[PDB]
């Protein structure tokens, strides 16, 4: 997104109904930080929610 | 018995990815240690290099 909220007015989207190759995210060279609790990001491509 | 140096060049980001367990661009596709690795990690800000 070209601007992001405010972290007070910090915003939510629902993802739903969707497949999601989290791969490209968490191999992705950009993001400086990308850190999971609860589970694991290699295997975030094996789930569901 | 032995020391192995292994010795290479990353973003300052990414030298949280050299360390056991870690995944990432650089420690999946690049240079992963094992999960029981034995060794030290050292690196250094080389800008002026």
Same mark, same amino acid.
């Given at each position: 997104a070209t601007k992001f909220a405010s972290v007070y007015a910090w915003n @939510?989207? @629902?993802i739903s109904n969707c497949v999601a190759? =989290? *791969?490209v995210l968490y191999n992705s060279a950009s993001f *400086?930080?990308?850190?999971? =609790?609860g589970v694991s990001p290699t295997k975030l491509n094996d789930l569901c929610f | 018995t032995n &020391?192995?140096?292994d010795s290479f &060049?990353?973003?300052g980001d990414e030298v949280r990815q050299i360390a056991?367990?870690?995944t990432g661009n650089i420690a999946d596709y690049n240079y992963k240690l094992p999960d029981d690795f034995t060794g030290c990690v050292?690196?250094?800000n080389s800008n002026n290099l």
């Open positions: @939510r989207k @629902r190759d =989290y *791969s *400086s930080t990308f850190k999971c =609790y | &020391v192995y140096a &060049v990353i973003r056991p367990g870690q050292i690196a250094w």
